[PDB]
Amino acid sequence: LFPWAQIRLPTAVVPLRYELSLHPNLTSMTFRGSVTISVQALQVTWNIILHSTGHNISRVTFMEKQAEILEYAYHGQIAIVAPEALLAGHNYTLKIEYSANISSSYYGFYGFSYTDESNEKKYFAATQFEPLAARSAFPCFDEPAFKATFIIKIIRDEQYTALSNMPKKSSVVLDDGLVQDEFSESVKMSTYLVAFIVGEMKNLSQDVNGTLVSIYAVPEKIGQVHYALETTVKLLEFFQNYFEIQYPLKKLDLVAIPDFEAGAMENWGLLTFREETLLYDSNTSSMADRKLVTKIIAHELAHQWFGNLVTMKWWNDLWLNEGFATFMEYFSLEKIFKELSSYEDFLDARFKTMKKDSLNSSHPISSSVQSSEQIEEMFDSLSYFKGSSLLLMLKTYLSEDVFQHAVVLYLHNHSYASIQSDDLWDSFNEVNQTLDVKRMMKTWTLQKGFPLVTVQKKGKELFIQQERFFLNTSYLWHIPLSYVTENYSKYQSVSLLDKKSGVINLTEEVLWVKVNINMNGYYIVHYADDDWEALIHQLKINPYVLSDKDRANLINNIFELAGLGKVPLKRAFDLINYLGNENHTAPITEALFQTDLIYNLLEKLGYMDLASRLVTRVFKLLQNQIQQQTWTDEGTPSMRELRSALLEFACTHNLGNCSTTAMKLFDDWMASNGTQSLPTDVMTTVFKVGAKTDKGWSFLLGKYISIGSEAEKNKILEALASSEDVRKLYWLMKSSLNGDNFRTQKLSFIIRTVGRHFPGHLLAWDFVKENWNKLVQKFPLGSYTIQNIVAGSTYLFSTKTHLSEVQAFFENQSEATFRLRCVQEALEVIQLNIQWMEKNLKSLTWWL
Amino acid sequence: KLFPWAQIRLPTAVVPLRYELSLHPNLTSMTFRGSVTISVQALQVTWNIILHSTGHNISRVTFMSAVSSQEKQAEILEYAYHGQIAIVAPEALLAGHNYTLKIEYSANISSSYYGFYGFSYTDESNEKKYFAATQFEPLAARSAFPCFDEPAFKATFIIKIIRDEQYTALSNMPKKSSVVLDDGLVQDEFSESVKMSTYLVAFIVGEMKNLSQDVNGTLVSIYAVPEKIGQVHYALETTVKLLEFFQNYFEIQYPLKKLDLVAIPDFEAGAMENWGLLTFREETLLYDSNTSSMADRKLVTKIIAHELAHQWFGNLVTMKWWNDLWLNEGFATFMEYFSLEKIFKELSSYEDFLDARFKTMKKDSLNSSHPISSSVQSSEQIEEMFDSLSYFKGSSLLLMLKTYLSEDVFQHAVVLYLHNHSYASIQSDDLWDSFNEVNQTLDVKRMMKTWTLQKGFPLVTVQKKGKELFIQQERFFLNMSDTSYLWHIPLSYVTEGRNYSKYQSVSLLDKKSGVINLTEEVLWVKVNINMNGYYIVHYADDDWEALIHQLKINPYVLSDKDRANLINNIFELAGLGKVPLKRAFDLINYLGNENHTAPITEALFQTDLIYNLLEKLGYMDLASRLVTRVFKLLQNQIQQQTWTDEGTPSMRELRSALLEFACTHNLGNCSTTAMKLFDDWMASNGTQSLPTDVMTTVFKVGAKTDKGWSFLLGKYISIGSEAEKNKILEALASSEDVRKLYWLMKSSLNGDNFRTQKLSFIIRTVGRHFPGHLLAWDFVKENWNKLVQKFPLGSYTIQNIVAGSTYLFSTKTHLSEVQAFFENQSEATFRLRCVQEALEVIQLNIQWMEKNLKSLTWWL
Numbered sequence A: 001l002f003p004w005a006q007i008r009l010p011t012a013v014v015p016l017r018y019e020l021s022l023h024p025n026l027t028s029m030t031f032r033g034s035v036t037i038s039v040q041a042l043q044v045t046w047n048i049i050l051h052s053t054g055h056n057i058s059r060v061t062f063m064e065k066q067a068e069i070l071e072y073a074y075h076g077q078i079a080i081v082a083p084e085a086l087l088a089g090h091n092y093t094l095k096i097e098y099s100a101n102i103s104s105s106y107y108g109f110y111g112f113s114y115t116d117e118s119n120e121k122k123y124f125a126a127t128q129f130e131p132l133a134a135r136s137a138f139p140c141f142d143e144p145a146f147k148a149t150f151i152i153k154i155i156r157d158e159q160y161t162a163l164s165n166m167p168k169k170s171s172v173v174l175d176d177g178l179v180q181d182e183f184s185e186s187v188k189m190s191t192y193l194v195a196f197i198v199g200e201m202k203n204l205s206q207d208v209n210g211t212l213v214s215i216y217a218v219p220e221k222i223g224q225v226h227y228a229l230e231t232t233v234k235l236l237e238f239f240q241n242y243f244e245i246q247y248p249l250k251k252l253d254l255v256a257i258p259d260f261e262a263g264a265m266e267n268w269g270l271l272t273f274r275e276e277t278l279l280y281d282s283n284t285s286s287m288a289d290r291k292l293v294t295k296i297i298a299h300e301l302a303h304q305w306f307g308n309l310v311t312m313k314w315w316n317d318l319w320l321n322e323g324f325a326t327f328m329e330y331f332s333l334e335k336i337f338k339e340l341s342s343y344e345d346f347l348d349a350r351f352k353t354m355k356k357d358s359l360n361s362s363h364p365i366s367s368s369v370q371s372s373e374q375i376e377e378m379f380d381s382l383s384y385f386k387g388s389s390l391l392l393m394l395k396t397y398l399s400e401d402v403f404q405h406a407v408v409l410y411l412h413n414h415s416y417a418s419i420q421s422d423d424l425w426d427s428f429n430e431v432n433q434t435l436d437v438k439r440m441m442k443t444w445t446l447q448k449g450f451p452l453v454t455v456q457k458k459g460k461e462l463f464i465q466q467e468r469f470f471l472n473t474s475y476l477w478h479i480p481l482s483y484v485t486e487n488y489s490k491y492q493s494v495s496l497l498d499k500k501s502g503v504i505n506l507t508e509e510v511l512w513v514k515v516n517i518n519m520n521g522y523y524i525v526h527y528a529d530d531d532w533e534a535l536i537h538q539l540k541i542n543p544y545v546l547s548d549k550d551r552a553n554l555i556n557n558i559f560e561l562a563g564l565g566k567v568p569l570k571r572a573f574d575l576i577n578y579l580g581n582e583n584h585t586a587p588i589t590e591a592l593f594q595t596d597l598i599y600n601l602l603e604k605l606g607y608m609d610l611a612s613r614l615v616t617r618v619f620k621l622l623q624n625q626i627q628q629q630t631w632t633d634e635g636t637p638s639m640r641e642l643r644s645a646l647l648e649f650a651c652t653h654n655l656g657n658c659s660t661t662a663m664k665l666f667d668d669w670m671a672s673n674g675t676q677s678l679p680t681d682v683m684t685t686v687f688k689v690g691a692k693t694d695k696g697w698s699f700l701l702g703k704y705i706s707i708g709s710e711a712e713k714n715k716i717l718e719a720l721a722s723s724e725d726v727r728k729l730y731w732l733m734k735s736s737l738n739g740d741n742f743r744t745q746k747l748s749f750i751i752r753t754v755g756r757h758f759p760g761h762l763l764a765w766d767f768v769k770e771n772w773n774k775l776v777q778k779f780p781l782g783s784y785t786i787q788n789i790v791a792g793s794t795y796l797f798s799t800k801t802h803l804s805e806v807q808a809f810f811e812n813q814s815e816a817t818f819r820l821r822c823v824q825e826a827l828e829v830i831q832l833n834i835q836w837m838e839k840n841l842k843s844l845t846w847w848l
Numbered sequence B: 001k002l003f004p005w006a007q008i009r010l011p012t013a014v015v016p017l018r019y020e021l022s023l024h025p026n027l028t029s030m031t032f033r034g035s036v037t038i039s040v041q042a043l044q045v046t047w048n049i050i051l052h053s054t055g056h057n058i059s060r061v062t063f064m065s066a067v068s069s070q071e072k073q074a075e076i077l078e079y080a081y082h083g084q085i086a087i088v089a090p091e092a093l094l095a096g097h098n099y100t101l102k103i104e105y106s107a108n109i110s111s112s113y114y115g116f117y118g119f120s121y122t123d124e125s126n127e128k129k130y131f132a133a134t135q136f137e138p139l140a141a142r143s144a145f146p147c148f149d150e151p152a153f154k155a156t157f158i159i160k161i162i163r164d165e166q167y168t169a170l171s172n173m174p175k176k177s178s179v180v181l182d183d184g185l186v187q188d189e190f191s192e193s194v195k196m197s198t199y200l201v202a203f204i205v206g207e208m209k210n211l212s213q214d215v216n217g218t219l220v221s222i223y224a225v226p227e228k229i230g231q232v233h234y235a236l237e238t239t240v241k242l243l244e245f246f247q248n249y250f251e252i253q254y255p256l257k258k259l260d261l262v263a264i265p266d267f268e269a270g271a272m273e274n275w276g277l278l279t280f281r282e283e284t285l286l287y288d289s290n291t292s293s294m295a296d297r298k299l300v301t302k303i304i305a306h307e308l309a310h311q312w313f314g315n316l317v318t319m320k321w322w323n324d325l326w327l328n329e330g331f332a333t334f335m336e337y338f339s340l341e342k343i344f345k346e347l348s349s350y351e352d353f354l355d356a357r358f359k360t361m362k363k364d365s366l367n368s369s370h371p372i373s374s375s376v377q378s379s380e381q382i383e384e385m386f387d388s389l390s391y392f393k394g395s396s397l398l399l400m401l402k403t404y405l406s407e408d409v410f411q412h413a414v415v416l417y418l419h420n421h422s423y424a425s426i427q428s429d430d431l432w433d434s435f436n437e438v439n440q441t442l443d444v445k446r447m448m449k450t451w452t453l454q455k456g457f458p459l460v461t462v463q464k465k466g467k468e469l470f471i472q473q474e475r476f477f478l479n480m481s482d483t484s485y486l487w488h489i490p491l492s493y494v495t496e497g498r499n500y501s502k503y504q505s506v507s508l509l510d511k512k513s514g515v516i517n518l519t520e521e522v523l524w525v526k527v528n529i530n531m532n533g534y535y536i537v538h539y540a541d542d543d544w545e546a547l548i549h550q551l552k553i554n555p556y557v558l559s560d561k562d563r564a565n566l567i568n569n570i571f572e573l574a575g576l577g578k579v580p581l582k583r584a585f586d587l588i589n590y591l592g593n594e595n596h597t598a599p600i601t602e603a604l605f606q607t608d609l610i611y612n613l614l615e616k617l618g619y620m621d622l623a624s625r626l627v628t629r630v631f632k633l634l635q636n637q638i639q640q641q642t643w644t645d646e647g648t649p650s651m652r653e654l655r656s657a658l659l660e661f662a663c664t665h666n667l668g669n670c671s672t673t674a675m676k677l678f679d680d681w682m683a684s685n686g687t688q689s690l691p692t693d694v695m696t697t698v699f700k701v702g703a704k705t706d707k708g709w710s711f712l713l714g715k716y717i718s719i720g721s722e723a724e725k726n727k728i729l730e731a732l733a734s735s736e737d738v739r740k741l742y743w744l745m746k747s748s749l750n751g752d753n754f755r756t757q758k759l760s761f762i763i764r765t766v767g768r769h770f771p772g773h774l775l776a777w778d779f780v781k782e783n784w785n786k787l788v789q790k791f792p793l794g795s796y797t798i799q800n801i802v803a804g805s806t807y808l809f810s811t812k813t814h815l816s817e818v819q820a821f822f823e824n825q826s827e828a829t830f831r832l833r834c835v836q837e838a839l840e841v842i843q844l845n846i847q848w849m850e851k852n853l854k855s856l857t858w859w860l
């Protein structure tokens, strides 16, 4: 029987080089493998323990002597019983011939089908091994810490272009007709980043510093790829220069996989992407589409250094490389594509991370992983964005040049190595001398949530106090504290608060103070009574004495504290009274977000008139801006992003000029059979307005089912779901669940849109209750999809009756179903809504 | 101090003979000063007179005897729990002797509309006017005056009331003496009454006008607010007609010299049968031959018949205890339909009786049903008897007894029962004893107790084998087991044999199994003629098919009552699972040749229940498939309908049904034809004639637009026609704008633009259709405490709200949710009759879906 019994593999045997040959028939979903694993023992062992799942092994041989396999499916491991005691430092070669099936679950070595522009059934195969799927494709030591070289050999038919990490060495025609493609030996790399593609593609290539960058897409979609290649070159030159370590490989391939459930990964030389995420069109694709494609290439590019070159010893440190890439996603962009204004997106991404972090349901970023399912739990965007946030707090604290130095030093000292997060902190610790220890970053990582810094200005000294930001414990953080002050003197400095209480002596007496410049520090600031009123006043006099980043932080910070009671809700609306003099998109959108949250929460309770007073108040503040808005695309990215916001708010709440302009624009587009171009920044608005009439709805539906453009399709879906006809709404969720007119993938987005407004509110949660089993069958538990379905449907419930109902439903399923992340998070949200209403509903009547 | 009476019921020892009540009510202050002079007699020996009194502040209590002018002071005892007051007598009450008890008191005129209640209303001259009336049934008389508040304790009443010169004061008996007092007030005195029950005493102090007609000796009169005395012509005309019928049929002339009917100017006003002072809510008596519809004409005719039949059945022959309340209430409900077929044959009210009976049969076949005759002990148990179910089942038992025996034999036993027990208190069994004088004792009415004492009704399975008709009997119970369940079933049967030889008869299944010897072989057999019998009839496969085929050949070989009974039965059995749903739709495939209203509305009812159930679940193609199939049959009947008020009441009702269905579903013309009518009515600023039959159909069509909805909302708050106001409300609640629908419910609960009384009708209308199905149930859950504050726990309203919002749920997820909500309220509330029944209903729906939902795809 099997000898080793543990999740992780023994440290005795170590892989050096991998010789993998695969013959996959794409029409059928089978593949014949041949793995020659060249290892070296370090400890005296009689057996080799490594991973293997869906494999029917023909002959297993140790080297020439045929060995034997032992099985352990619980850990997904296999054992080879050696004829001799494997001696220390001795190289050994182990061959395994196997039979396996090409995956359908879009995981590991997967396969699918599609229809060409010529309407011909075409086959395609690809890989997605992160975190534990490499073992399904080939028997191997599937652990990141087990870096080795890879010689990959793929047998394929003529029509198909076979791809892999490294460049192709030789393509030889076999006697059966099939071509055997051989690939250059890989650099020292972990099993998970190993990739191989088999598909009928076309290319778009641009050479740089001998390294050939190419974009692989389906021949019918090789026209939209043009922007992506141009972007990749720019960012590759940026990264190679920033990190000061040249890109290792002689090729860099980015690939648009022709499926919507495609596995998008940072594969070393074979960057995978869902077809849609790279298709940019300079004439139609909006600012949302330019920023999205630009963000994705930059993310999977920063991974080539932070995740491929320098790899984590184990998954418990995944937040580091995913956090580092997400920071380079926003960093590199503000350096080379400065006009995009991608900081605004990071600022909003940060704001959301903070609300999900404030919850008792929150989890600390640095947490030890041992369980099989605990590894897939590390794949949440919360850890990635909090991780990215604390690298911004670090980068802003110590110089931009001091930060880069430690980055270059870490990548050099760890090139082709496996690390623990602390090794980046150590690389930082060499500040030219060792100033502060990295127990600071350990306060942030090791404990859940973030802090509330309480400022009190008394003359020339500002009394600072920190505490756990909780909604309702001895929590202590090491916080850098940036701050700007005002005979019109603009002074800014930084201070480290390591203790529960502190103070900052000022050079001169100042009128206003704003702690946390551009919110760069992952915290919420609460000023004392007269200090809130100081900024509130200044915002009304001249707000430009502060940045848009600084301004939107006060808007978010006042509106968060208003929920928790440290500030009354009247003060939140007293701050935003300055909006009549706001022209920069970042604060305007944060206000509109905040106000829309209060609106819907109120509306769902049925305070329809009070809720409308909230929107007539906000409209009266954004009236000039709303009136000044042009129904075009002529403007800077941030300015056309503002256009979309302002026109979506006024048209949603049917405010003066709006609806009629959109309705006129809609009727014209309809008469023209949808052939007459509409500005993209007004598209969704005009569509939403038009779907409010049976004729327009039936028209839009008919265009959604016909059109090519997925970006336009999404805008049509959002519109069709914004309708007030509950029968139309129900049918959408029904038809999407069956995959009738809409893919099951767009279902979550529908349920989220349906339940956002009064007609479909109860309907969406009813749908989640009645189709729970079908939903759980189609999307597994813990799935991103099932987590937004429960959040989308329940979030706007603000009654004890609703809380009892949500709780009762989730108990009646399973005890494992009630004790879930998304369930216990949703129930915590309804409770907080119940609380926000008891604190803040009373007053409202009298002042809105 | 120690009370001498621990029991609920008053002792038999002291019995009242005469009461002399003097009252001075100040309607502007809603307070009254009273004086009672009870002439009692002792049958047993006692030191304490135990009677009833609540809300009273007693000043002086004095006691007299036999041949003594002098009044001895006596002390009162309190016991608020049973509403009782004990009088500690100075002299021992010696059996046989008569004594006079006198009590002077102060009290408040009721805030609510129970006992001696008061209210104000506005004039046609924008002036405020005060009014007072009574509602003593069941335990309220004790709130107005200290008395022996039990229906058995019967006495004569001398009521005297001091009122302001402008108010017209009324009571049971005609006025004897009105004498102007020195202060400018009038002291009205009414002649000594007949031997009557305490809950039947009445008096009204109101500024009203009259309309009178002297039928023989009796001056019948209708009293109303001066501004609405013109609309009581039909009311009187009808009352005079029915009074000739009842007196003649009962063979006992009305004992009073006058018969007064009054339209109380309040919506909540206590509507009852007080001898000679029949009270009714204004709304229920106002009728106009032009502006009013069919239901309106029927309602006012039925409500007059009911309160009138009660003068004999309830007033002249009252029941000893509240446990026999179903006897007189079912008898008045039976005369409500009987008299109307006798006089008002044109109304075709037999159709309304059939439907009521169909709806009774459904609620009575649930496990939550309780037998009509069950021991009443407390006030809660007394109020439990005030449900229309015991009345309607009772009405159905009397129809079955009238049909089994002759119409002439039913009349003999009736006249016999009244004559013998006139001015006496009765036990339920005395009616059956009078019937047992059948020419003598040919059969026992121990048959009737098989019906009264059991819950539900029987399922009768029939099997034809040559010239032998095999009968079986079992409790019609819906799945989800005691064998004491046996009924003495009167079996009416109709057939056809050689050359259309139409034969009919009766048999009595007093055993589990039986056999009927048929004359010859028959092409078909039909059991329970005109559904006179309170039961369901199932058939063996071939016998069901024989009737199904005959309905396709010539269905008029059967009555319209028989034809609607078969549509009910097949569909009911299809629920239980005794017949596949395929058979039910095969029977109704005969409907292409159906011209009678009764079968059409019943087909529609059963079909609208499936549609609504399928629609609340996602099955919206099946739901449309069902409606297009029904439409295909009824096409001509829909197409032949003229948008008018022309024709007989029956064919008028048909038009309303056929066109209401056709617009609801939007089938061809209907909608456009209604929308044309709506626009024209809206164009004339709502000052144009809409035919009452097509009115609601027209209103609903317009209400589907923001323009229409708003025009209608404006007309609701403005106009006076409460009948038309209700037609507008149904339409406003028929809207598909979730926001408009919520606003309606929220408003009626805060009493904003719609009064709180209409909330239950709103909640039910919102909930019936997809847009507001979840919205109405959510509203009931969220606003539950205000709902239960406003309408008490156990009221008809709260049952109505619970039924309406839930009945369309057919998922286990929905069933758990409903349970959980009520379980989280209280286990005292979760154990209510209406909640248990609500969950029972969902459970039965889930079972109906699991039985018939899957095969439905393949047909319709």
Ligand SMILES: *[C@@H]1O[C@H](CO)[C@@H](O[C@@H]2O[C@H](CO)[C@@H](O)[C@H](O)[C@H]2NC(C)=O)[C@H](O)[C@H]1NC(C)=O
Residues within 6 Å of the ligand: A016, A089, A090, A091
């Ligand atoms: C184990 O195998 C590796 C295979 O690469 C051997 O490494 C090579 O050693 C030769 C000298 O003997 C060098 O010229 C190569 O450059 C080495 N290659 C690499 C990538 O290391 C290694 O010597 C073997 N060890 C034993 C114990 O035999």
Ligand SMILES: *[C@@H]1O[C@H](CO)[C@@H](O[C@@H]2O[C@H](CO)[C@@H](O)[C@H](O)[C@H]2NC(C)=O)[C@H](O)[C@H]1NC(C)=O
Residues within 6 Å of the ligand: A024, A025, A026, A027, A028, A155, A156, A157, A158, A159, A178
């Ligand atoms: C998968 O196996 C099938 C075996 O049928 C191969 O199909 C042949 O494909 C060529 C084109 O490359 C056609 O011209 C032949 O007609 C096909 N053969 C038959 C018998 O239909 C296919 O090439 C195999 N693919 C791989 C990658 O091995």
Ligand SMILES: *[C@@H]1O[C@H](CO)[C@@H](O[C@@H]2O[C@H](CO)[C@@H](O)[C@H](O)[C@H]2NC(C)=O)[C@H](O)[C@H]1NC(C)=O
Residues within 6 Å of the ligand: A203, A204, A205, A214
């Ligand atoms: C697809 O990729 C190939 C390289 O793999 C590109 O081939 C080069 O093409 C240029 C001209 O465009 C020649 O000067 C080079 O000598 C070619 N190199 C090789 C290795 O063949 C090809 O251009 C790419 N396709 C497109 C449309 O850009």
Ligand SMILES: *[C@@H]1O[C@H](CO)[C@@H](O[C@@H]2O[C@H](CO)[C@@H](O)[C@H](O)[C@H]2NC(C)=O)[C@H](O)[C@H]1NC(C)=O
Residues within 6 Å of the ligand: B025, B026, B027, B028, B029, B162, B163, B164, B185
């Ligand atoms: C109720 O009591 C009031 C107050 O004593 C009486 O009010 C009088 O009403 C008449 C009209 O009905 C007026 O002309 C008088 O001026 C009122 N007087 C006062 C002082 O308000 C009323 O009459 C009493 N009613 C009864 C039935 O007793």
Ligand SMILES: *[C@@H]1O[C@H](CO)[C@@H](O[C@@H]2O[C@H](CO)[C@@H](O)[C@H](O)[C@H]2NC(C)=O)[C@H](O)[C@H]1NC(C)=O
Residues within 6 Å of the ligand: B168, B209, B210, B211, B212
């Ligand atoms: C019912 O209305 C009639 C209307 O006429 C009243 O009758 C009049 O009564 C007065 C005495 O109150 C007589 O002097 C008149 O001669 C009667 N009118 C006629 C035409 O005969 C009658 O009093 C009213 N009754 C009640 C109690 O309201």
Ligand SMILES: *[C@@H]1O[C@H](CO)[C@@H](O)[C@H](O)[C@H]1NC(C)=O
Residues within 6 Å of the ligand: A054, A055, A056, A099, A100, A101
């Ligand atoms: C491959 O698929 C077939 C079904 O098509 C299945 O029976 C077989 O077990 C699969 N192979 C492996 C190794 O699981």
Ligand SMILES: *[C@@H]1O[C@H](CO)[C@@H](O)[C@H](O)[C@H]1NC(C)=O
Residues within 6 Å of the ligand: A056, A057, A058, A099
């Ligand atoms: C495993 O592979 C061999 C290849 O020769 C095949 O014949 C055999 O059927 C496979 N085993 C199973 C259990 O499918």
Ligand SMILES: *[C@@H]1O[C@H](CO)[C@@H](O)[C@H](O)[C@H]1NC(C)=O
Residues within 6 Å of the ligand: A505
């Ligand atoms: C701040 O001022 C206080 C005296 O008010 C003094 O104790 C402290 O050392 C000062 N710190 C700095 C850094 O100026």
Ligand SMILES: *[C@@H]1O[C@H](CO)[C@@H](O)[C@H](O)[C@H]1NC(C)=O
Residues within 6 Å of the ligand: A544, A583, A584
């Ligand atoms: C917003 O207005 C201020 C006014 O001082 C100006 O400095 C700023 O440039 C304006 N922003 C834009 C985008 O025009």
Ligand SMILES: *[C@@H]1O[C@H](CO)[C@@H](O)[C@H](O)[C@H]1NC(C)=O
Residues within 6 Å of the ligand: A673, A706
């Ligand atoms: C234009 O309208 C026709 C129907 O009249 C439709 O078939 C066609 O697809 C529409 N045009 C385009 C480019 O889709």
Ligand SMILES: *[C@@H]1O[C@H](CO)[C@@H](O)[C@H](O)[C@H]1NC(C)=O
Residues within 6 Å of the ligand: B055, B056, B057, B106, B107, B108
């Ligand atoms: C009702 O009558 C009593 C006297 O019997 C009195 O004390 C009480 O205040 C009255 N109720 C109200 C509501 O005034």
Ligand SMILES: *[C@@H]1O[C@H](CO)[C@@H](O)[C@H](O)[C@H]1NC(C)=O
Residues within 6 Å of the ligand: B057, B058, B059, B106
């Ligand atoms: C009525 O009210 C109170 C008792 O609630 C009492 O003080 C008052 O004197 C009573 N009135 C008479 C006339 O007895």
Ligand SMILES: *[C@@H]1O[C@H](CO)[C@@H](O)[C@H](O)[C@H]1NC(C)=O
Residues within 6 Å of the ligand: B017, B066, B096, B097, B098
């Ligand atoms: C009065 O008393 C006698 C016995 O003393 C009794 O028989 C008689 O019935 C009573 N009077 C009336 C009118 O009931």
Ligand SMILES: *[C@@H]1O[C@H](CO)[C@@H](O)[C@H](O)[C@H]1NC(C)=O
Residues within 6 Å of the ligand: B515, B516, B517
């Ligand atoms: C019916 O006929 C049979 C003869 O077949 C006879 O014995 C029986 O008594 C009859 N029963 C009735 C109820 O007529």
Ligand SMILES: *[C@@H]1O[C@H](CO)[C@@H](O)[C@H](O)[C@H]1NC(C)=O
Residues within 6 Å of the ligand: B556, B593, B595, B596
């Ligand atoms: C109904 O049925 C037929 C026509 O199909 C006819 O003989 C009969 O008289 C009609 N009944 C009425 C009341 O019109």
Ligand SMILES: *[C@@H]1O[C@H](CO)[C@@H](O)[C@H](O)[C@H]1NC(C)=O
Residues within 6 Å of the ligand: B685, B718
């Ligand atoms: C419509 O008629 C009502 C009276 O029935 C009146 O109050 C209203 O003002 C009328 N409107 C117009 C515009 O005449």
